[PDB]
Design an enzyme around this catalytic site. Structure first.
Site, PDB file in Angstrom:
ATOM      1  N   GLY A  33       0.772  -1.224   0.000  1.00  0.00           N
ATOM      2  CA  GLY A  33       0.000   0.000   0.000  1.00  0.00           C
ATOM      3  C   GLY A  33       0.808   1.281   0.000  1.00  0.00           C
ATOM      4  O   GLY A  33       2.033   1.268   0.157  1.00  0.00           O
ATOM      5  N   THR A  34       0.088   2.389  -0.181  1.00  0.00           N
ATOM      6  CA  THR A  34       0.649   3.743  -0.188  1.00  0.00           C
ATOM      7  C   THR A  34       1.577   3.965   1.001  1.00  0.00           C
ATOM      8  O   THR A  34       1.482   3.284   2.017  1.00  0.00           O
ATOM      9  CB  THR A  34      -0.486   4.796  -0.121  1.00  0.00           C
ATOM     10  OG1 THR A  34      -1.036   4.998  -1.427  1.00  0.00           O
ATOM     11  CG2 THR A  34       0.025   6.106   0.437  1.00  0.00           C
ATOM     12  N   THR A  35       2.485   4.918   0.881  1.00  0.00           N
ATOM     13  CA  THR A  35       3.380   5.182   1.993  1.00  0.00           C
ATOM     14  C   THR A  35       2.811   6.304   2.877  1.00  0.00           C
ATOM     15  O   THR A  35       2.105   7.194   2.396  1.00  0.00           O
ATOM     16  CB  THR A  35       4.837   5.496   1.478  1.00  0.00           C
ATOM     17  OG1 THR A  35       5.569   6.215   2.478  1.00  0.00           O
ATOM     18  CG2 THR A  35       4.805   6.273   0.181  1.00  0.00           C
TER      19      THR A  35
END
Lengths: 111, 241, 242, 198, 250, 244, 233, 244, 243
Positions: free
Chosen positions: H30-32
């Site tokens: 997932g996104t950071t």
């Protein structure tokens, strides 16, 4: 001891004409010997061309009207926006009222 | 807490547990029922894997649900008791509330639903039982004969059979029962019943029990002799040719 | 094993699909909707000559303005009909009026997916889907004559004509041609009777087949054998006529 | 209350029950049968609260009948009364008890002897030569305590009842509209249709 | 969440065996040996305190437990299962008996209670049988002295003397030779100590051994005086000292 | 989820059989043989103690013959523990019946109830069946002397003489061979001992490996008496019948 | 692989995927196409109703949740019913208790949270339907895309279903154009129909096959079908 | 054998819980997002992939508040993250209701801790598909936390998770060293915007949208507030500048 | 069949693999700890390892204060350790409430052990991959050390150690006691006991420690507390001036 509920007075009247009908009622709301409001509407437009009033104990009358209106709303949601006939509204209200047969809505109601 | 779905669909559209329930019915002893013009008869065979029993107290195959209705079955005995019980209770309840005993179709429809229900409820397997419910509706004289199966399906028959070799005996009845002229007598009705059982019982005087139901709660089971007398006369029908 | 409410990689529910396979093995059922009523006919399909053909009830009355036909595991349809009848009567008690055909159907389909072993959404206590499909036909002041197809998938479609069961894909194609927005009730009766004759394994007669309809005037009625037998005759004649 | 009498003679049990059904100021029915047949040889009469009365009777009737079919056997009068007492005894300590008093008269085919049981809504059971519920008992126990003999024939029993019913019509304040009599013996239960003047 | 293991974890195999019960027994077979001998005026149960480290305090670990003042138990198998069993046993002795009759339960019944608990862990949904075998020794006014063995299956039987665990077979044989229906409590205690020595590899003394008896009443262990009818508990655990003294006469 | 470890103990085999029941029965087949023989003046229950030792206390022991009521007793074949669970609930049912009708529970009524409980574990719940088979020996004023038998399936039937546990086929044949309707308790006692003697998987048939019980209506009385023979009593009757 | 980790939602694959959820998403695609786009005054739902036979109806795909909110469905109808109904209650509750119309953004949070529950507990199955919610609240026009995964997003316009990729690219282009169709409903609708046709192929949107719904500044969410849409074909 | 990875509460031979580890995969995918603890508060920032031009800018918010002083951001399965916050929110209300005072950050951490750990105990539930960074200011300081699907969590000076957790962590470690005296709320806000920009390289393919929030005893009075308008642009630029 | 390795049921050999594997998990943190008894106190030492620089060192601990008098150190993953800690605290608070006196260390151990024994028998609850060492100066037993494992087993020690190199620490201690002939550290101040503890920890692990490599907890009459970086440093300096 706590008494659930009260009486807010007023009166409402309903007369049916050949192709029309009326539901009137004063706008005075009281408690004992004091006036709470000289203008507190008590007859409502509920939709599908139906006006109703629940006179007596305000709290009960409001809860009922509110419950009925919401009843009309779901009648649409559940029967492809079919219009609620006055006779059907009546029966629906009988159920609403008799539902609290053992802790009644202290109200006289006309539609 | 146990609700595993034991009766579910398979790729081909079959409920194997219900299917296998029927296999348990095929295995059970045979049972048959033929309706006359003023009666209904229920015959059943008696196993012989072990013989030395006490016929007096060993549970009989035909059971009374009420004074005017009987139920016989093929399959797991244990399972049938559960159904008989429920039927009997529903029978009393129906009288208590409707103020009139159940009709054979009603009692049949009830038993069938119980069965149907066990086919799509969690944590339970179907009844490995098929039944033949017969009798006379209240104040009626037209005989009634119905049959149910694990699936929950049910219908009426002029005559029918279930259990092992029911295949064979059904044929007999298909080409031995004329709806035009049904066994106009209790006697010729009981005979047609034994004849059909002999096709499978293979000489079993003590391996065949018949029960006769007439209108107005008139139910009675025949004793070895009475039946044996039907066997005797029948074997002569054969030899006299 | 594998969840009774699992998804195939193609986005389908196994149990519901396998359910449909069962319905294919069912007795044929056909419905034709016209501006003069809806006709419902079914293949009795007795499994033995000893079985009293009229004890086979594959067409039932939900209410006086709603009737239905079933196909597949018919035993599964009892609770569905029961639910339906109750819903109809109940609606009438609460509102002093007839339940709309679509609403009634929507109500029946609500039971459809209520199956599983612990499906987080309510209390869906049913081990498997229904192994039967229904043709719900009726009439109401808002949308007149209607024909609906209720499946174990919970979804229901409205048809002008529809066939379900063993001879469905076949009979369906037939209906395609034969159906037109101006069919008369009588035409629709014969039509259903004819299409049943093609798909049925047995030679259709007033005993292994049953007709019925629903008209605003007299509601839902199931044609007694005599009445049907004559329509059978009337059909053989119109066919032999060319 | 209503009149509920029971008297056990030599080879039978006789039950006399008033026929009136009054609510308020009006006598609604004058041909009421305040009895239910629990089994071929067991009869039960009852009196008490308006609804509870029949509901209870029929409820008990259903259970006995169910037992009869399940076991294909008729429970002894003693057994049936023990069942009924336990029921009432459970009721008395429930949310809303059954306010019903009963008389159970039956002919025990195994002992070949008639039996009479008196059980009130509290679950108080007792076997007697003769019994009654309500105010009736206040006139009939001493009446029977005088004119009663164990060896009396069914006929002598019916005369004994007539004597009771007459005493009740004379002194009781209410018009119970006569009684319905029934005999329980080795041959089942039968109703004396001629007591309105026997 | 919610235990969704509502089905049995112990079932019948095609052969007729109940696998988990068998395996539970296997677990018991591995446990340290323990035994029990019944004399004419007492019973003795003993086992080995197989300390799992010289740093551990063997005292803070009794394998011999008092259930009622006249009943004691010892085991072989999985200690933890035993511990909770003793708890349930001690409690059921009250809830199902003392609180009803005002007196502690007789040996056979309490044993019957324990057996019930174990039987259930053989059929109830989502559980494994208990991995222990118990030896319960007690005395009650109408049954005198008794010795019982309870197995994972829930089965239990009365013994004159017996052993369970590691060298049970060997020990059972040694008992059959030295037992007789005239043994005095001390004679059994002696015999007990002998049988146990064969099953011990290392140190054999009052600190590596746990032995208790069900004999006479100990008014000295009652805790109070003033009630004639109350004479004291018949169950007494022997002290490390009292053991050694008998070891020198071994 | 857990569905992965569920044995599905209540399902049908493609042949319409109940796996668990069949396997439970298979288990029962290795249990000490139990025999019930019903005579004109009583019933006899004899059982073989599976496994025993010198040290086993036979006096205080019981693993096959249990008293349910004062007129009904049972012979066990299978898991003793399972048997005790059913025995106790069986004992309660008897008492409820009594408290309700002020009459002792008819033998079949009690037998059916217990069998129904068994049938339950056969159709729902996902638990294993009870690995037990019973021979019921009782008496009631409606059918007098009665002998019944129930197994894991929940099925039950009545017999004149019957066996359960190990070598039933052999024992049944021997019984079917020497049983005679007019028999007498003492006769049955002997028939019973002989049968066990010829089917034992042991060397000799000694008293220490037996449990014996009879239900007679002792002439000098008029009521029913249940007698559960004591070690000594068994040893005697063993010699007398000529097995010393 | 997959075959061993797709038995139920409660299972994670070795890579971190929830196949059951994914298979659910796959039901959306198999579903008919529908499109939603909003200006600053209105929001429109144009959905292509699919038919079984030529004797069958074109199953309704637009549900109204309240006077100010509604949605379009692509996937399992029953599931859309369940979800729409739930939303209808949330709207209703908000009114009755707080006398406040439910914020479209909040309706989205409610849908996400409800879906998420069927993806972490044993026994349940994910919802097999995609939803497009449009509405006019105290902050203007709104459009939401609801995925069974539990992911709900607010967009200017979008589409879901079969070939939905056509309409979505078209709108990703027409963006600057329709976003300014303020005060003009018929234009936003036409702009929608021109987006939905970008995913046709089989046929052409007929009268009894097209379905449009709209809501905005002075337009209570309303649904048009048949003759009502004729003037848009 | 194998298959130790198909059921959630199962222990593999080496003592691990594979299902939890697979959950981590979903997180890393997932996104950071990150968290920076400063001298009197904390800053949260996350990457918001612009899948298309249709995404109404600034609308689809991700950072969430708990009560009035807690800020939460997470990487992984977003729906799971919301679920965990809903709980935390109740968890917080419950605490306040009984103790009056708003829940201490550490106390709050364990609440989420215990709840997440709970989803690794049974096979009837799936572990959480998110790693969460949350924190705030309380009775004694500011606290930054990160919670793993395993339920494990610790206090951090700086923390990051998601696609570019390494780039981030790298940057964060620099900050920790080059500021032994403590960063400032104003400073951290920019620094954060930068780290998101840098860490965006491991996803440089798609365009993203920045989102920051903070809780500083002085800058926000200890309340969690989102960074908007000017202060946001100022930080966006501070990054845009050092990205080159 | 092969599922006897996934759930808590017996394997043919009579073993419970899941419990065995649970034990494996207790070494996952690669930390060693040991506890020794003073004359009137109890000390527990445990390695503290902080790998990440981004971590707030003050939040990394495997030592817990269960009650005013009980201290518990865990060997195993932190989430399970915290789960066990919270339960232990809850359990200790309720005990005091219901019985009117502070829950004794051995009792809390027995209680926690029993709870673990349950995860051993009931299928749906997984064992906790941790070992719990409870310490205190019981008002009846004096200095006490009690430890429990995923098996549900529990016992009291004169001293003990746990972790990967648990065995070297144990034999080290064993030897020291074979020598001293007593079951404790004959010291008046806990400061010297803590030192002794840290000392033998070094000798056994063959490693030197800094003030941030250890974690110390002390239990005394009516109070159990943990030492600070500085409290430890002071201890380290003391042992430094002897070697």
């Amino acid at each position: 001891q706590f008494n659930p509920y009260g009486d807010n007075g007023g009166t409402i009247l309903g007369i049916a004409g050949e192709d029309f009908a009326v539901l009137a009622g004063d706008t005075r709301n009281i408690t004992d010997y004091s006036i709470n409001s000289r203008y507190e509407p008590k007859v409502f437009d509920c939709g599908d061309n139906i006006v109703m009033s629940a006179n007596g104990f305000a709290a009960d009358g409001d809860a009922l009207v509110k419950r009925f209106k919401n009843s009309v709303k779901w009648y649409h949601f559940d029967h492809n926006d079919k219009k609620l006939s006055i006779n059907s509204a009546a029966r629906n209200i009988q159920h609403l009222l008799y539902g609290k047969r053992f802790f009644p809505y202290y109200v006289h109601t006309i539609i | 807490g146990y609700d595993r779905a034991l009766s579910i669909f398979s790729p081909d559209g079959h409920i194997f547990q219900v299917e296998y329930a029927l296999e348990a019915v095929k295995r059970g002893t045979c049972a048959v029922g033929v309706k006359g013009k003023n009666c209904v008869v229920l015959g059943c065979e008696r196993r012989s894997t072990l013989k030395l029993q006490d016929t007096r107290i060993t549970p009989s195959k035909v059971s009374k649900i009420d004074s005017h209705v009987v139920l016989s079955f093929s399959g797991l005995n244990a399972d049938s008791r559960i159904l008989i019980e429920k039927a009997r209770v529903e029978a009393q309840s129906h009288r208590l509330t409707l103020e009139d005993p159940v009709t054979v179709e009603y009692l049949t429809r009830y038993v069938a639903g119980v069965q149907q229900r066990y086919t799509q409820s969690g944590g339970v397997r179907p009844f490995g039982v098929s039944t033949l419910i017969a009798g006379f509706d209240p104040r009626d004289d037209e005989p009634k004969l119905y049959q149910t199966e694990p699936s929950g399906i049910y219908s009426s028959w002029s005559a029918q059979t279930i259990g092992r070799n029911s295949k064979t005996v059904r044929e007999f009845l298909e080409k031995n029962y004329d709806r035009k002229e049904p066994p106009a007598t209790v006697e010729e009705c009981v005979k047609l019943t034994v004849r059909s059982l002999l096709e499978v019982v293979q000489t079993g005087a003590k391996n065949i029990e018949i029960t006769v139901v007439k209108p107005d709660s008139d139910i009675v089971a025949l004793s070895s002799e009475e039946i044996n007398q039907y066997v005797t006369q029948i074997e002569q029908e054969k030899q006299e040719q | 094993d594998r969840g009774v409410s699992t998804f195939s990689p193609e986005g389908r529910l196994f149990q519901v699909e396998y359910s449909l396979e069962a319905i294919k093995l069912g007795s044929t059922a056909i419905g034709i909707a016209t501006k003069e009523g809806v006709v419902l006919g079914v293949e009795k399909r007795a499994t033995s000559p000893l079985l009293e053909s009229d004890s086979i009830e594959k067409i039932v009355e939900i209410d006086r303005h709603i009737g239905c036909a079933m196909s597949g595991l018919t035993a599964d349809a009892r609770s569905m009909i029961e639910h339906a009848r109750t819903a109809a009567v109940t609606h009438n008690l609460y509102y002093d009026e007839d339940i709309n055909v679509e609403s009634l159907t929507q109500s029946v389909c609500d039971l459809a997916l209520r199956f599983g072993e612990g499906a987080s959404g309510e209390e869906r206590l049913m081990s498997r889907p229904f192994g039967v499909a229904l043709l719900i036909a009726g009439h109401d002041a808002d949308d007149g004559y209607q024909l609906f197809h209720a499946e174990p998938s919970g979804t229901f479609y409205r048809y002008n004509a529809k066939a379900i069961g063993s001879g469905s894909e076949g009979a369906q194609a037939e209906l395609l041609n034969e159906w037109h927005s101006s069919l008369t009730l009588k035409e629709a009766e014969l039509l259903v009777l004819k299409i049943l004759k093609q798909v049925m394994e047995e030679k259709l007669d007033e005993n292994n087949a049953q007709l019925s309809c629903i008209t605003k005037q007299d509601g839902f009625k199931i044609y007694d054998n005599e009445k049907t037998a004559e329509l059978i005759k009337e059909l053989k004649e119109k066919e032999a006529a060319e | 209350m209503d009149i509920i009498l029971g008297i056990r003679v030599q080879d039978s049990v006789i039950l006399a029950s008033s026929k009136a059904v009054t609510r308020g100021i009006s006598v609604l029915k004058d041909s009421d049968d305040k009895t239910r047949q629990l089994s071929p040889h067991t009869l039960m009469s009852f009196a008490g609260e308006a609804g509870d009365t029949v509901q209870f009777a029929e409820y008990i009737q259903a259970n006995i009948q169910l037992y009869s079919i399940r076991e294909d056997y008729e429970l002894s009068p003693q057994a049936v009364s023990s069942f009924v007492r336990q029921e009432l005894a459970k009721s008395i300590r429930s949310r809303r008890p059954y306010q019903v008093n009963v008389l159970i008269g039956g002919y025990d085919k195994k002992k070949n002897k008639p039996e009479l049981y008196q059980i009130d809504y509290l679950g108080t059971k007792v076997e007697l030569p003769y019994g009654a519920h309500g105010y009736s008992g206040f006139y009939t126990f001493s009446l029977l305590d005088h004119h009663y003999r164990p060896d009396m024939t069914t006929e002598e029993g019916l005369d004994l009842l007539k004597l009771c019913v007459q005493e009740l019509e004379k002194r009781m304040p209410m018009d119970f509209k006569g009684v319905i009599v029934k005999i329980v013996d080795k041959d089942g239960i039968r109703q004396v249709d001629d007591f309105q003047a026997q | 969440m919610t235990d969704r293991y509502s089905f049995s974890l112990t079932t019948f195999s095609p052969s007729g065996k109940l696998g988990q019960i068998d395996y539970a027994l296997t677990a018991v077979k591995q446990g340290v040996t323990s035994l029990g001998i019944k004399a004419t005026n007492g019973v003795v149960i003993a086992t080995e305190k197989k300390s799992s480290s010289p740093l551990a305090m063997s005292e803070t670990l009794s394998k011999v437990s008092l259930l009622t003042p006249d009943i004691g138990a010892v085991y072989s198998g999985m200690g933890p299962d035993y511990r909770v069993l003793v708890d349930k046993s001690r409690k059921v002795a009250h809830t199902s008996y003392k609180r009803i009759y005002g007196e502690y339960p007789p040996t056979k019944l309490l044993v019957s209670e324990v057996a019930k608990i174990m039987q259930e862990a053989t059929q109830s949904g989502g559980v494994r049988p208990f991995g222990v075998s118990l030896l319960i020794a007690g005395h009650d006014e109408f049954n005198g002295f008794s010795l019982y063995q309870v197995d994972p299956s829930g089965s239990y039987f009365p013994w004159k003397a017996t052993a369970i665990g590691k060298g049970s077979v060997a020990a059972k044989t040694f008992l059959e030779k030295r037992w007789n229906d005239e043994l005095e409590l001390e004679d059994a205690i002696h015999i007990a100590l002998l049988t146990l020595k064969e099953s011990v590899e290392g140190e054999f003394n009052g600190d590596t051994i746990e032995l208790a008896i069900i004999g006479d009443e100990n008014p000295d262990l009652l805790g109070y005086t003033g009630i004639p009818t109350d004479k004291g508990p018949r169950f007494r655990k022997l002290t490390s000292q009292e053991i050694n003294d008998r070891l020198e006469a071994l | 989820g857990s569905r992965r470890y569920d044995s599905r103990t209540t399902i049908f085999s493609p042949e319409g059989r109940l796996y668990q029941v069949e396997y439970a029965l298979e288990s029962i087949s290795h249990a000490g043989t139990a025999i019930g023989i019903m005579a004109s003046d009583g019933i006899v229950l004899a059982a073989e103690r599976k496994v025993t030792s010198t040290l086993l206390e036979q006096d205080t022991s019981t693993e096959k013959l249990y008293k349910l009521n004062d007129k009904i007793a049972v012979a066990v074949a299978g898991l003793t523990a399972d048997a005790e669970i059913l025995i106790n609930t069986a004992r309660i049912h008897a008492q409820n019946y009594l408290k309700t009708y002020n009459e002792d529970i008819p033998v079949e009524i009690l037998v059916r109830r217990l069998s129904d409980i068994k049938q339950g574990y056969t159709q729902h719940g996902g638990l294993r069946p009870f690995g037990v088979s019973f021979i019921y020996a009782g008496y009631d004023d409606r059918y007098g002397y009665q002998l019944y038998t129930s197994n894991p399936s929940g099925n039950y039937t009545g017999w004149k003489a019957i066996s359960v546990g190990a070598n039933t086929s052999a024992a049944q044949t021997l019984l079917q061979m020497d049983y005679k309707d007019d028999m007498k308790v003492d006769d049955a006692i002997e028939l019973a001992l002989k049968t066990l003697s010829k089917t034992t998987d042991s060397s000799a048939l000694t008293y220490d490996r037996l449990e014996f019980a009879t239900i007679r209506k002792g002439a000098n009385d008029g009521e029913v008496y249940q007698k559960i023979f004591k070690p000594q009593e068994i040893k005697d009757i063993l010699v007398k019948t000529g097995i010393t | 692989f997959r075959n061993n980790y797709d038995g139920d939602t409660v299972t994670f694959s070795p890579t971190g995927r929830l196949f059951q959820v994914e298979y659910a998403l796959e039901a959306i695609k198999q579903g008919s196409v529908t499109v939603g786009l909003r200006s600053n005054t209105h929001a429109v739902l144009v959905a292509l109703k699919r038919n079984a036979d030529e004797l069958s109806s074109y199953q309704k795909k637009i549900i109204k949740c309240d006077e100010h909110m509604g949605l379009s469905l692509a996937g399992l109808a029953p599931d859309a019913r369940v979800l729409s109904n739930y939303l209808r209650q949330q709207c209703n509750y908000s009114s009755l208790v707080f006398n406040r119309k439910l914020a479209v953004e909040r309706a989205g949070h409610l849908l996400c949270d409800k879906a998420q529950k069927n993806t972490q507990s044993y026994g349940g199955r994910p919802y097999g339907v995609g939803l497009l919610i449009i509405g006019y609240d105290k902050s203007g026009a709104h459009l939401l895309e609801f995925q069974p995964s539990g992911n709900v997003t607010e967009l200017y316009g979008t589409a879901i279903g079969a070939r939905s990729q056509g309409a979505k690219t078209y709108l990703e282009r027409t963006l600057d154009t329709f976003i300014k169709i303020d005060g003009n409903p018929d234009e936003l609708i036409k702009a929608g129909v021109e987006a939905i046709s970008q995913s046709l192929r089989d046929e052409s949107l007929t009268v009894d096959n097209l379905s449009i719904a709209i809501v905005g500044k002075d337009t209570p969410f309303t649904i048009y079908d048949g003759e009502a849409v004729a003037k848009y074909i | 054998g194998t298959g130790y990875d198909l059921s959630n509460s199962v222990f593999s031979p080496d003592g691990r819980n594979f299902q939890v580890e697979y959950a981590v995969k979903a997180v890393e995918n997932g996104t950071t997002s990150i968290g920076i603890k400063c001298n009197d508060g904390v800053v949260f920032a996350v990457e918001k992939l612009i899948t298309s031009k249709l995404l109404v800018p600034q609308k689809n918010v991700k950072i969430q508040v708990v009560d009035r002083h807690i800020g939460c951001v997470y990487s992984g399965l977003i729906p799971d993250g919301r679920h965990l916050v809903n709980r935390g929110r109740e968890e917080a209300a419950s605490f306040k209701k009984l103790y009056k005072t708003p829940i201490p950050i550490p106390a709050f951490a364990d609440r989420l801790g215990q709840y997440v750990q709970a989803h690794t105990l049974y096979n009837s539930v799936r572990p959480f598909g998110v790693s969460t960074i949350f924190g705030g200011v309380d009775k004694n300081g500011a606290h930054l936390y990160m919670l793993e699907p395993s339920g494990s969590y610790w206090g951090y000076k700086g923390a990051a998770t998601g696609k570019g957790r390494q780039s981030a962590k790298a940057e964060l470690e620099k900050l920790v060293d080059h500021h032994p005296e403590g960063l400032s709320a104003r400073e951290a806000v920019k620094q954060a915007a930068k780290i998101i920009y840098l860490a965006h390289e491991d996803n440089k393919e798609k365009d993203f949208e920045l989102e920051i929030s903070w809780c500083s005893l002085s800058e926000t009075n200890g309340l969690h507030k989102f960074v908007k308008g000017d202060l946001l642009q100022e930080a966006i630029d501070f990054a845009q500048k050092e990205i080159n | 069949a092969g599922y006897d390795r996934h759930i808590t049921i017996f394997s043919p050999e009579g073993r419970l693999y899941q419990v065995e594997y649970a034990f494996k998990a207790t070494n996952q943190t690669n930390i060693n700890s040991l506890a020794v008894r003073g004359k009137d106190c109890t000390v527990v030492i445990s390695q503290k390892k902080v790998p990440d620089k981004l971590l707030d060192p003050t939040t990394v601990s495997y030592i817990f204060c269960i009650s005013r008098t009980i201290g518990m150190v865990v060997n195993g993953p932190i989430p399970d350790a915290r789960n066990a800690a919270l339960r232990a605290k809850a359990e200790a608070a309720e005990f005091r409430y219901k019985y009117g006196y502070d829950m004794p260390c051995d009792v809390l151990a027995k209680r926690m052990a029993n709870l673990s024994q349950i995860y051993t028998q009931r299928a749906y609850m997984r064992p906790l991959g941790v070992i719990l060492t409870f310490v205190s100066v019981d008002e009846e037993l004096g200095p006490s050390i009690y430890k429990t494992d995923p098996a549900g087993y529990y016992v009291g020690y004169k001293a003990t150690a746990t972790g990967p190199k648990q065995q070297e620490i144990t034999t080290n201690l064993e030897n020291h006691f074979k020598k001293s002939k007593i079951d404790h550290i004959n010291e008046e101040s806990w400061e010297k006991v803590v030192e002794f503890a840290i000392t033998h920890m070094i000798d056994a692990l063959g490693t030197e420690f800094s003030k941030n490599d250890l974690e110390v907890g002390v239990a005394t009459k009516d109070k159990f507390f943990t030492l600070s970086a500085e409290n430890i440093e002071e201890r380290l300096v003391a042992i430094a001036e002897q070697d």
